[PDB]
Ligand binder design. Structure first.
Ligand SMILES: CC(=O)N[C@@H]1[C@H](O[C@H]2[C@H](O)[C@@H](NC(C)=O)[C@@H](OP(=O)(O)OP(=O)(O)OC/C=C(/C)CC/C=C(/C)CC/C=C(/C)CC/C=C(\C)CC/C=C(\C)CCC=C(C)C)O[C@@H]2CO)O[C@H](CO)[C@@H](O)[C@@H]1O
Ligand SMILES: [Cl-]
Ligand SMILES: [Mg+2]
Length: 255
């Protein structure tokens, strides 16, 4: 239960925040343990409409890191940890980031296994083959609809050599929505040191009924083009798509 430097609620919110009645956002960061945040997924929950929209932020996105200038998005966590990542997201999308969850491999695997695996419909032989290479044959997935365990799901959300980081972000949002779906079919705290978030376990349980009864789940994608001036790769964002995304998330959050 880490406390954000910003204080009580997001500085982007104009009115007082009511976590039980207001639409809210959650930033999910996956750490590859010096440790780096290679997974970056923002989920915005529209309370009134009972909808959630997932957005993967390309780790190479060319964005302003407050106090550091334009750089790769993932460098915000490297420079200033979770606090600076939250600030970078709020400036980039001009929306409040209400909650943040930081996870390493172990928390992810334990969560998946606690849910008795997550359902994924694997469809690409190239993805299957690259995961085999990634894991030196420890993880061998099958095409079709199957339940993956923690080790299999982790390799699935990590692979990328067969296909860009944007396809990896789509595999992350795919697995995230499968985790939510599998938590629906549950009965009714050893993850410490592996899962850090800015709210208590109690407050998290309070949101579970709402999160597990959404009418729709959608994925959003920030489009762009490669920007490689001097041997450093950035992903410049399409400013029209960025604005459309900002408007959609602002409207979803009531701002
Ligand atoms: C040069 C160098 O320094 N080294 C070299 C080489 O390095 C390679 C990598 O090998 C190479 N890797 C690969 C695979 O291809 C690639 O690097 P990479 O892309 O950085 O990936 P990597 O670090 O492996 O794994 C990490 C990738 C990730 C994507 C992060 C995953 C972490 C997670 C935690 C899972 C996230 C999953 C999600 C679905 C997202 C959202 C959910 C969560 C975040 C968590 C929990 C959520 C909960 C509980 C529920 C709450 C729900 C609500 C609140 C609503 O490239 C490198 C460079 O060429 O390594 C060799 C030895 O191995 C060395 O000899 C070499 O010198
Ligand atoms: Cl696939
Ligand atoms: Mg990494």
């Amino acid at each position: 239960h880490v406390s954000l430097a910003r204080g009580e609620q997001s500085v982007k919110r104009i009115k007082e925040f009511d976590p039980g009645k207001d639409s809210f956002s959650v930033l999910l960061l996956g750490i590859d343990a010096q440790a780096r945040s290679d997974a970056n997924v923002l989920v915005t929950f529209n309370r009134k409409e009972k909808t959630a929209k997932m957005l993967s932020i390309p780790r190479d996105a060319y964005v302003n890191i407050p106090g550091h200038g334009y750089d790769k998005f993932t460098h915000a966590h490297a420079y200033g940890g979770v606090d600076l990542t939250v600030k970078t997201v709020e400036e980039m999308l001009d929306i409040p980031v209400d909650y943040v969850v930081e996870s390493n491999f172990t928390a992810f695997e334990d969560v998946v296994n606690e849910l008795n695996g997550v359902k994924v419909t694997v469809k690409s032989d190239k993805v299957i083959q690259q995961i085999k290479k990634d894991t030196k044959g420890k993880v061998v997935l099958q095409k079709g609809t199957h339940t993956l365990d923690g080790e299999e799901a982790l390799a699935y959300v990590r692979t990328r050599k067969a296909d860009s980081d944007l396809l990896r972000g789509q595999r992350q949002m795919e697995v995230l929505s499968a985790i939510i779906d599998k938590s629906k079919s549950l009965s009714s705290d050893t993850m410490g040191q592996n899962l850090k978030m800015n709210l208590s376990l109690k407050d998290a349980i309070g949101l579970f009924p709402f999160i597990t009864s959404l009418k729709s789940v959608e994925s959003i994608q920030l489009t762009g083009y490669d920007y490689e001036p001097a041997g450093v790769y950035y992903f410049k964002l399409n400013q029209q798509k960025l604005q459309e995304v900002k408007k959609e998330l602002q409207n979803d959050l009531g701002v």
